Design a binder for this molecule. Structure first.
Ligand SMILES: CCCCCCCCCCCCCCCCCC(=O)OC[C@H](CO[C@@H]1O[C@H](CO[C@H]2O[C@H](CO)[C@H](O)[C@H](O)[C@H]2O)[C@H](O)[C@H](O)[C@H]1O)OC(=O)CCCCCCCCCCCCCCCCC
Ligand code: CLA
Ligand code: CLA
Ligand code: CLA
Ligand SMILES: CCCCCCCCCCCCCCCCCC(=O)OC[C@H](CO[C@@H]1O[C@H](CO)[C@H](O)[C@H](O)[C@H]1O)OC(=O)CCCCCCCCCCCCCCCCC
Ligand SMILES: CCCCCCCCCCCCCCCC(=O)OC[C@H](COP(=O)(O)OC[C@@H](O)CO)OC(=O)CCCCCCCCCCCCCCC
Ligand SMILES: CCCCCCCCCCCCCCCC(=O)OC[C@H](COP(=O)(O)OC[C@@H](O)CO)OC(=O)CCCCCCCCCCCCCCC
Ligand SMILES: CC1=C(/C=C/C(C)=C/C=C/C(C)=C/C=C/C=C(C)/C=C/C=C(C)/C=C/C2=C(C)CCCC2(C)C)C(C)(C)CCC1
Ligand SMILES: CC1=C(/C=C/C(C)=C/C=C/C(C)=C/C=C/C=C(C)/C=C/C=C(C)/C=C/C2=C(C)CCCC2(C)C)C(C)(C)CCC1
Ligand SMILES: CCCCCCCCCCCCO[C@@H]1O[C@H](CO)[C@@H](O[C@H]2O[C@H](CO)[C@@H](O)[C@H](O)[C@H]2O)[C@H](O)[C@H]1O
Ligand SMILES: CCCCCCCCCCCCO[C@@H]1O[C@H](CO)[C@@H](O[C@H]2O[C@H](CO)[C@@H](O)[C@H](O)[C@H]2O)[C@H](O)[C@H]1O
Ligand SMILES: CCCCCCCS[C@@H]1O[C@H](CO)[C@@H](O)[C@H](O)[C@H]1O
Ligand SMILES: CCCCCCCS[C@@H]1O[C@H](CO)[C@@H](O)[C@H](O)[C@H]1O
Ligand SMILES: CCCCCCCS[C@@H]1O[C@H](CO)[C@@H](O)[C@H](O)[C@H]1O
Ligand code: OEX
Ligand SMILES: [Ca+2]
Ligand SMILES: [Ca+2]
Ligand SMILES: [Cl-]
Ligand SMILES: [Cl-]
Ligand SMILES: [Fe+2]
Ligand SMILES: [Mg+2]
Lengths: 57, 39, 504, 30, 38, 342, 65, 34, 34, 38, 57, 37, 81, 34
């Protein structure tokens, strides 16, 4: 059901920059490290197939 | 000469011995107080 | 009949045939040692201990022979690069031969013990049944092991009656076999002190002799005899396997971190020496001393031994290999021929730039150059369209000091870039990639392979220990549980003490 | 030779399926 | 003193409601103050 | 023979609600400290000084993002004892230096030993064969290879897995990007053992439940079983025919069936452990050499293998600066690997 | 079974199968040695680990030139 | 493709040696007295 | 009839006592603002 | 391609028709006990 | 051509794959969710370039 | 010579043959790619 | 059964709740105050929201030496003015 | 530290309270066991 619902882009929990200090500095958590990993995957996949900035499917 | 880390080693050793000793004293005492019935 | 995985159990109550199977195993192992040594001699190239030492060539048993003082060939060469040496009989060849002969003799002895299995020695005089008195046997064998350990330490390692052991300087440049005196102070327990290896064998030898005599003369207490099933040979199997996995984890560990018994000239450098730039620091220290003594830059870098520079190269780091990348290190980057010299990069403003080195974690790594304060000054870009730091924009050049390229400067971007790419691996070398059809992909050294095999085997032997300990302590139920097991024995509260019928 | 090896192992596996199914030791109620 | 005076189904109901309240509070906290991204 | 030892043995082996035993002396404090250490850390303790991360409920993390993180890379493989030379007896500093990580790993290891010893001890008291302990050897091999051997082969405890949900997810992704761990045949055997074990669990439970004998009048069939009964509660014969006709083969021996259920997942986990031991040394199955020689020479040659390596390269470049702060990576924008547009 | 010269010489070394000392015998002493050995292993481990750092003991390749 | 030249015999003996071991054991079981 | 303080009582409280303390602490945390 | 298409259509139709008429051929009664499920 | 960008991906043993790298490759992004049976292609060579086998299977 | 009373016959049933062959062949199908490299 | 009083008996008894209606809220309030007075921050050395960085700093206070790690941490703490 | 007293005070008032509501049966328990 996970795969079948992520099929319609209802995705995993997103805690990117959820933790912020008193001034407003981003305090990274393990979630943000996951985010960096995912960015690596995203920017590299199908390297010649995207012409526009957002991968919308 | 006794370095700080050797003194620390002694502290850890003593502490472990104390934990084990207190544990066995307590268990033995309890075992002596509350014996199983037989025969 | 017996299932396939139990065929060897026919030995449990047959000491003669057990001794035969053990003799056969011993014959096979000694035969392997002989064969392996022969193969290495048929493939080993002794012509360059500086850039082609044994650990670049996939040599696995050669360094174990060298470690204990066997360094020469009947053919006249030695692993330290000497010529016209007479090793006497105990050359690498002599060792291989002795192992082959041992193998043959053990084979024959195995045949005799298999045929003549029914010796009166193996029967309990009171019952006439096959029986081994394992406690006294342990005493005898421990006494022998003790005498041997002691003799190895007091005679072989000290040079009193024997060759000594492989020792070297902290940078693995001048290693050789030397007599080593025992170290009796606390530094004896320093893994990097050889004197402690000596002291260990003397002291533990003596302790082994004493404990052996104790185990010969004093019977086990009834409570321990009963608890450990000392009448059952499988108990000795279980505990022996335990001792063995302990020892295997220990040798894996000391191979990986380094110790006085795992020298870099025999097994290759450690990963931690790359991690901490150990060799680079020594190199820079020497160059700085030379400069301060009034040498020129060329002279200073030219005074660096090629062997030292070669240690400062990631291709020799054992944490750079692959599980299925087989063979010697030479099959990867090639056979090292010569140091190209130390590369100094500069920008158009004449500022010196430093290539960021590859950490062992990364199969590939970008090319980034910073100034002495870590500020980025040049790189090789991926996307070009908004590049600011390209070698072309920054006018990066490279000049060499020492080695084959000493005194030369290059200014064409492709060349400068090629050298920067190599500079991420540390010092730069020229390689022969044709002789072996080398494929340019890094392989681990014998330090690596040894570490891997022994950690794996130790871990599997943990399971062996568990399994045989279980078979030992639960022998009575291993064909199944009592068909008459009463529910009361597993019903809660029936017995005050679990499994104890006298506590109803 | 690699392709041949892969395909051979696969083929042996399929043959094994056949024997394991149609030429199994028949289960028997004692 | 002795077992039975307070029916088990009431104990279970109140206990469970307590669990719901506390977990509810924890979910509230995901949207306010620290960890809220705001 | 009824001295203090035997009296103690008596007390230790009493049939009480929670069985204790000699093994309990090792197991209970170590398991308790490991669990308590994890709860304590994830509730109150930061990873700011070791990782540059917030990691506790106190700082605003949730259940998915809290962790007890590994020590800084500069600690190496220090045991990091509270009274050791790094913390020097200072509890607060010890927490700030990552001491809870080794506290939990080590007490956890000794507790696992205690638990397996408990399995042996109880089996012996009750009079059953010790296959449950034996099967537990697989959890042991995984824990020891992943949390101990692996970082011991690397530069420091920093690269061990951190104890947290998201932290573990990060561990998985690190292993893909840096080790190409999915390519490893030891991991693949692990996967087969885990999924095969899950398959066996499901199919066996379902088969038993659908070949039940009618041993009662109720439409809810659970009550028509008595623990003391001698008869099989389901038909092995019917089960055998069904599976023979559906799948081609079927179990016919119940003893072999249950042994196999032990064998499959236990062996899978052991195999994965072996692969991780190699990864401790970076001895990866990272590449196929023939693939790389061909692709290097031929810019039209493409497989899913080469496609995955580009993903790994993305992971490494994009995650390293923040995931490995002690390295002080500064990767200018122009060197970051990226396809078109993204 | 078959007697031999060497077998007859070794006979007494394999004639005490199952022989035990009464009760606990030398167990306490054994326990003492096990404890000492445990402490010894803790010492060498902590030295190698740089958790125990001793004067004149430099755990490094640069131990002695 | 530039494969490892020992791969063929490695795979062949990996399959043949244990398979033959099993076949030997099976056939001699069948031939034992019923 | 029944004892109060047993091994079971002890285990139960070693878990339950810190749990309630920890739950109060995490509750308070929900009202902390940067 | 047209011949292939026609052929596949005919094959598929044949098997679907077998399925449908087969399940219509007194299926509830094809069981080992109580057959009169009509 | 899995991604419909005229960049064909090799999946078969004879075309440079081993057991681990080999695959039957998904049909072309140019096709999308369109039904692509053999008889929709002008030829088998076309059918194969566009990943027809994936859909059939 | 007097016969050895510790000898035991050995057995491998057909099912065990099939399981063993499946294990070996599947292991080979798995590891062969890595042997060819 | 192993002898101890059944839980269902205990948690349905009046005396149980006379005791625990006090002990449970008391523990809960103690934990609250552990956070609310700020004691937790000081015990575990966890940064308050205003104590991750000094006003203009943007670099992590990463520990970089094993044996002087403690003093490094102390220096980091001083630099928060 | 006043905060330590502030925090631990609720726990002590609990332990001291539960003792009063259980002391006779605890004395009875230890006296019976002995
Ligand atoms: C099975 C089931 C059983 C149930 C499980 C029971 C769990 C028990 C718990 C045991 C805990 C063991 C802690 C090991 C700590 C360790 O190792 O700590 C590491 C230290 C070595 O220290 C390291 O050493 C490195 C190299 O330094 C050396 O090299 C440098 C560069 O040249 C410098 O010269 C430096 O001065 C010199 O010392 C770096 O300094 C590292 O930062 C530093 O951490 O070794 C040591 O203490 C001891 C090393 C030898 C003994 C190892 C035995 C145990 C480990 C076996 C597995 C090995 C894994 C290998 C990978 C595969
Ligand atoms: C402790 C064991 C050990 C170690 C560490 C070494 C180390 C070395 N050997 Mg030596 N060798 C050994 C024993 C060892 N050898 C033995 C027993 C033999 C006789 C066969 C040899 C014969 C030999 C030759 C002929 C050569 C070497 C060479 C080398 C060097 C290259 C190693 C390599 O590429 O491996 C690659 C390692 C692997 C690919 C790992 C294999 C992993 C296996 C296949 C996993 C099996 C999985 C299993 C089936 C799963 C079961 C599952 C089931 C239980 C469910 C290296 C220094 C080479 C060299 O450079 O010589 C100068 C060389 O030519 N060795
Ligand atoms: C000193 C080491 C040692 C010794 C002497 C034994 C001896 C025994 N084992 Mg134990 N065991 C050990 C270590 C040892 N084991 C280890 C390390 C493990 C974990 C891997 C085990 C796990 C184990 C299990 C699960 C079982 C035994 C059993 C047995 C008994 C029957 C063996 C047999 O007939 O196999 C016959 C084996 C074959 C006919 C073929 C084996 C082929 C192997 C799997 C692959 C090739 C091995 C290779 C040639 C060896 C290379 C050497 C190695 C160092 C690299 C025998 C008493 C059995 C038993 O208890 O019976 C009552 C049993 O069920 N052992
Ligand atoms: C009973 C089971 C048990 C076990 C196996 C462990 C094991 C461990 N604890 Mg844990 N611990 C426990 C219970 C246990 N603990 C309990 C109940 C508490 C609460 C008090 C703790 C609180 C605790 C803390 C706060 C810490 C540990 C730490 C450790 C680790 C280092 C221990 C050490 O070096 O001791 C050394 C001592 C011995 C091995 C004693 C051996 C005694 C010998 C055999 C007898 C001789 C003694 C001799 C006569 C004494 C002379 C002293 C004199 C010379 C000065 C080790 C994993 C440390 C850690 O995890 O760092 C990451 C750590 O900081 N423990
Ligand atoms: C009474 C007896 C109890 C005995 C317990 C014995 C010890 C075991 C304790 C295990 C507890 C593990 C979960 C704690 C979760 C928590 O406290 O979150 C505490 C967090 C706190 O909420 C966070 O608080 C912060 C405060 O600054 C911020 O506001 C964050 O935004 C906010 O998310 O709550 C949540 O994350 C919401 C979901 C929590 C529930 C998740 C449970 C998932 C299931 C776990 C599966 C593992 C098996 C457990 C079985 C038991
Ligand atoms: C009622 C909810 C059902 C959906 C949940 C799934 C449970 C049943 C389906 C499993 C299929 C296994 C294969 C067949 C296995 C099989 O043959 O089952 C057989 C088993 C016993 O059969 P009986 O014939 O005795 O009883 C079933 C009927 O005949 C009515 O008496 O069926 C049940 O126990 C039904 C249980 C319903 C009540 C269970 C509720 C479970 C809810 C769990 C939700 C948790 C969510 C947590 C998320 C974090
Ligand atoms: C609709 C028709 C569908 C047919 C599809 C074909 C099914 C093929 C099933 C496997 C046949 C081979 C079994 C040999 C082995 C064999 O004959 O086993 C026979 C064995 C019978 O067990 P018994 O209980 O009768 O054995 C008792 C004693 O004889 C044991 O000593 O069955 C099992 O052990 C079940 C567990 C193993 C199940 C193994 C599943 C294998 C799945 C395939 C995995 C590899 C695929 C690789 C693809 C490249
Ligand atoms: C009789 C005689 C003789 C002769 C002898 C000889 C000639 C011997 C030889 C011997 C030999 C020549 C032996 C050999 C051996 C070998 C071995 C024993 C090996 C084994 C191996 C293994 C076991 C391996 C395994 C593996 C593989 C394969 C892969 C990878 C993984 C591993 C490592 C596991 C003389 C004249 C002296 C005199 C007396 C009589
Ligand atoms: C570390 C340390 C230590 C220890 C400590 C301890 C021992 C602690 C404990 C602690 C604890 C012991 C805590 C607890 C906690 C708990 C909690 C926090 C819980 C929570 C829960 C919840 C939240 C729930 C949830 C859920 C689930 C799970 C499922 C169902 C649903 C729900 C959602 C309800 C010592 C001092 C020794 C030393 C130093 C260090
Ligand atoms: C069975 C579970 C029952 C759970 C019931 C929970 C209690 C119900 C809500 C309690 C009332 C809230 O009381 C709340 O107290 C906290 C102090 O901790 C105050 O919080 C105050 O301190 C924090 C730091 O500790 C500051 O960041 C905050 O800006 C300040 O207002 C809140 O301003 C107040 O709103
Ligand atoms: C487009 C697909 C076709 C859709 C058709 C649906 C329209 C409704 C009409 C359905 C007609 C069903 O007709 C069905 O055919 C078979 C074959 O004669 C009949 O006859 C069957 O009866 C018995 C039942 O005990 C079977 O054992 C026997 O094999 C068979 O002859 C069914 O009793 C009848 O009900
Ligand atoms: C089985 C073959 C035996 C061959 C023996 C040849 C002895 S060789 C002899 O050995 C001495 C000790 O190494 C040396 O001192 C001496 O130089 C050397 O010639
Ligand atoms: C040919 C480009 C001009 C610069 C020389 C390249 C850097 S150095 C070059 O590196 C090779 C490994 O790639 C070695 O095999 C070779 O021996 C060495 O000359
Ligand atoms: C390990 C346990 C060593 C116990 S020592 C043993 O203990 C008995 C009582 O238990 C005494 O009666 C006896 O004299 C003593 O030798
Ligand atoms: O296709 Mn296969 O992957 Ca689903 O996102 Mn869009 O499109 Mn492509 O990119 Mn990302
Ligand atoms: Ca070539
Ligand atoms: Ca604010
Ligand atoms: Cl992709
Ligand atoms: Cl697009
Ligand atoms: Fe079952
Ligand atoms: Mg919040």
């Amino acid at each position: 059901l996970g795969i079948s619902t992520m099929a319609f882009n209802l995705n995993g929990f997103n805690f990117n920059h959820s933790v912020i200090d008193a001034k407003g500095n981003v305090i990274n958590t393990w979630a943000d490290i996951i985010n960096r990993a995912n960015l690596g995957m995203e920017v590299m996949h199908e390297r010649n197939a995207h012409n526009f900035p957002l991968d919308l499917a | 000469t006794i370095t700080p880390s050797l003194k620390g080693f002694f502290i850890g050793l003593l502490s472990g011995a104390v934990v084990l000793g207190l544990t066995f004293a307590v268990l033995i005492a309890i075992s002596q107080i509350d014996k199983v019935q037989r025969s | 009949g017996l299932p396939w995985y139990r065929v060897h159990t026919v030995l449990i109550n047959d000491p003669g045939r057990l001794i035969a199977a053990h003799l056969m195993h011993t014959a096979l192992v000694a035969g392997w040692a002989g064969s392996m040594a022969l193969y290495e001699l048929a493939t080993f190239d002794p012509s360059d201990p500086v850039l082609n030492p044994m650990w670049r060539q996939g040599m696995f048993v050669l360094p174990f022979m060298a470690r204990l003082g066997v360094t020469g060939s009947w053919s006249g060469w030695s692993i330290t690069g000497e010529t016209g040496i007479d090793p006497g009989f105990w050359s690498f060849e002599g060792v291989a031969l002795a192992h082959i002969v041992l193998s043959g003799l053990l084979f024959l002895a195995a045949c005799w013990h298999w045929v003549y299995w029914d010796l009166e020695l193996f029967r309990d005089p009171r019952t006439g049944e096959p029986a081994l008195d394992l406690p006294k046997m342990f005493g005898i064998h421990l006494f022998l092991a003790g005498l041997l350990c002691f003799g190895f330490g007091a005679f072989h390692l000290t040079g009193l009656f024997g060759p000594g052991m492989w020792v070297s300087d902290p940078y693995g440049l001048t290693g050789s076999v030397q007599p080593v005196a025992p170290e009796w102070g606390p530094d004896g327990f320093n893994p990097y002190n050889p004197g402690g290896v000596v002291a260990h064998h003397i002291a533990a030898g003596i302790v082994g002799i004493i404990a052996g005599l104790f185990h010969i003369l004093v019977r086990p207490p009834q409570r321990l005899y009963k608890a450990l099933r000392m009448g059952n040979i499988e108990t000795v199997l279980s505990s022996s396997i335990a001792a063995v996995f302990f020892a295997a984890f220990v040798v894996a560990g000391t191979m990986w971190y380094g110790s006085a018994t795992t020298p870099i000239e025999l097994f290759g450098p450690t990963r931690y020496q790359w991690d901490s730039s150990y060799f680079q620091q020594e190199i820079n220290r020497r160059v700085q001393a030379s400069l301060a003594s009034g040498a020129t830059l060329e002279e200073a870098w030219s005074a660096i031994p090629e062997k030292l520079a070669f240690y400062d190269y990631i291709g020799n780091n054992p944490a750079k290999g692959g599980l299925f990348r087989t063979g010697p290190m030479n099959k990867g980057d090639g056979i090292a021929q010569a140091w190209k010299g130390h590369a100094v990069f500069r920008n158009k403003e004449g500022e010196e730039l430093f290539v960021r080195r590859m950490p062992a974690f990364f199969e590939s790594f970008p090319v980034i150059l910073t100034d002495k304060n870590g500020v980025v000054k040049a790189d090789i870009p991926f996307r070009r369209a908004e590049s600011k730091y390209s070698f072309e924009q920054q006018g990066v050049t490279v000049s060499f000091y020492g080695g084959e390229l000493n005194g030369q400067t290059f200014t064409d971007p492709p060349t400068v870039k090629s050298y920067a790419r190599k500079a991420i691996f540390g010092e730069i070398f020229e390689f022969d990639t044709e002789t072996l059809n080398s494929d340019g992909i890094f392989r681990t050294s014998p330090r690596g392979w040894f570490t891997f095999a022994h950690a794996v085997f130790a871990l599997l032997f943990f399971f062996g220990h568990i399994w045989h300990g279980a078979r030992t302590l639960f022998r009575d139920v291993f064909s199944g549980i009592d068909p008459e097991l009463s529910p009361e024995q597993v019903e809660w509260g029936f017995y005050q003490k679990v499994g104890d019928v006298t506590t109803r | 030779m690699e392709t041949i090896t892969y395909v051979f192992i696969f083929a042996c596996i399929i043959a094994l399926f056949f024997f394991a199914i149609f030429f199994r030791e028949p289960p028997r109620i004692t | 003193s002795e077992g039975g005076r307070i029916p088990l189904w009431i104990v279970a109901t109140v206990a469970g409601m307590g669990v719901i309240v506390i977990v509810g509070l924890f979910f509230y906290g995901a949207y306010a103050g620290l960890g809220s991204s705001l | 023979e009824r001295g203090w030892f035997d009296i103690l043995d008596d007390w230790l082996k009493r049939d009480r609600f929670v069985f204790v035993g000699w093994s309990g002396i090792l197991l209970f404090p170590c398991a308790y400290l490991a669990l308590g250490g994890w709860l304590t850390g994830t509730t109150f303790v930061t990873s700011w000084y070791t990782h540059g991360l917030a990691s506790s409920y106190l700082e605003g993390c949730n259940f998915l993002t809290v962790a007890v993180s590994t020590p800084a890379n500069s600690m190496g493989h220090s045991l990091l004892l509270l009274w050791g030379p790094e913390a020097q007896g200072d509890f607060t500093r010890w927490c700030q230096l990552g001491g809870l990580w080794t506290f939990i790993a080590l007490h956890g290891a000794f507790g696992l030993i205690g638990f397996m010893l408990r399995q042996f001890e109880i089996a012996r008291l009750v009079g059953v064969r010790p296959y449950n302990a034996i099967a537990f050897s697989a959890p042991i091999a995984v824990f020891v290879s992943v949390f101990l051997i692996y970082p011991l082969g690397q530069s420091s405890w920093f690269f061990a897995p951190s104890f947290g949900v998201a932290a573990i997810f990060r561990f998985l992704l690190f292993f893909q990007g840096f080790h190409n761990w999915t390519l490893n045949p030891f991991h693949m055997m692990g996967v087969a053992g885990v999924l095969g074990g899950a398959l066996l669990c499901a199919i066996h439970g379902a088969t038993v439940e659908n070949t039940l004998f009618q041993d009662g009048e109720g439409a809810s069939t659970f009550r028509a079983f008595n623990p003391t009964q001698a008869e099989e509660t389901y038909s092995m014969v019917t089960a055998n025919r069904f599976w023979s006709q559906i799948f081609g083969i079927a179990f016919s021996n119940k003893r072999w069936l249950h042994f196999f259920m032990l064998f499959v997942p236990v062996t899978g986990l052991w195999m994965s452990a072996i692969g991780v031991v190699g990864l401790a040394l970076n001895l990866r199955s990272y590449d196929f050499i023939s693939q790389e020689i061909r692709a290097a020479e031929d810019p039209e040659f493409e497989t899913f293998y080469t496609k995955n390596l580009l993903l790994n390269e993305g992971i490494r470049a994009w995650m390293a600066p923040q995931d490995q702060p002690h390295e002080n990576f500064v990767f200018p924008e122009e060197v970051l690997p990226r396809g078109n547009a993204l | 079974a078959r007697r031999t010269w060497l077998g007859d010489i070794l006979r007494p070394l394999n004639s005490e199968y199952g022989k035990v000392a009464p009760g606990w015998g030398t167990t306490p002493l054994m326990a003492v040695f096990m404890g000492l050995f445990l402490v010894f292993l803790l010492i060498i481990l902590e030295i190698y680990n740089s958790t125990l750092i001793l004067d004149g003991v430099n755990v490094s390749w640069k131990a002695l030139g | 493709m530039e494969v490892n030249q020992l791969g063929l015999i490695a795979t062949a003996l990996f399959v043949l040696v244990p398979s033959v071991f099993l076949i030997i054991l099976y056939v001699q079981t069948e031939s034992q007295q019923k | 009839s029944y004892p109060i303080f047993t091994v079971r009582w002890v285990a139960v409280h070693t878990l339950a006592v810190p749990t309630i303390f920890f739950l109060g602490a995490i509750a308070a945390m929900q009202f902390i603002q940067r | 391609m047209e011949t292939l298409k026609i052929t596949v259509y005919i094959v598929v139709t044949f098997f679907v028709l077998l399925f449908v008429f087969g399940f219509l051929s007194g299926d509830p009664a094809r069981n080992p006990k109580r057959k009169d499920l009509e | 051509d899995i991604d419909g960008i005229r960049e064909p991906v090799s999946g078969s043993l004879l075309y440079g794959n081993n057991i681990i790298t080999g695959a039957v490759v998904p049909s072309s992004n140019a096709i999308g969710l369109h039904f692509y049976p053999i008889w929709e292609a002008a030829s088998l060579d076309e059918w194969l370039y566009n990943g027809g086998p994936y859909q059939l299977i | 010579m007097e016969p050895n009373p510790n000898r035991q016959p050995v057995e491998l049933n057909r099912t065990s043959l099939y399981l063993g062959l499946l294990l070996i062949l599947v292991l080979a199908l798995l590891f062969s790619s890595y042997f060819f490299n | 059964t192993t002898g101890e009083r059944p839980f269902s008996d205990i948690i349905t008894s009046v005396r149980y709740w006379v005791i625990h209606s006090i002990t449970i809220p008391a523990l809960f309030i103690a934990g609250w105050l552990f956070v609310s007075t700020g004691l937790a921050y000081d015990v575990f050395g966890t940064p308050r929201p205003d104590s991750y960085y000094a006003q203009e700093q943007r670099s992590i206070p990463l520990v970089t030496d094993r044996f002087e790690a403690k003093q490094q941490v102390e220096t980091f703490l001083e630099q928060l003015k | 530290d006043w905060r330590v007293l502030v925090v631990l005070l609720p726990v002590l008032l609990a332990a001291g309270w539960a003792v009063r509501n259980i002391l006779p049966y605890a004395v009875k328990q230890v006296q019976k066991l002995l």
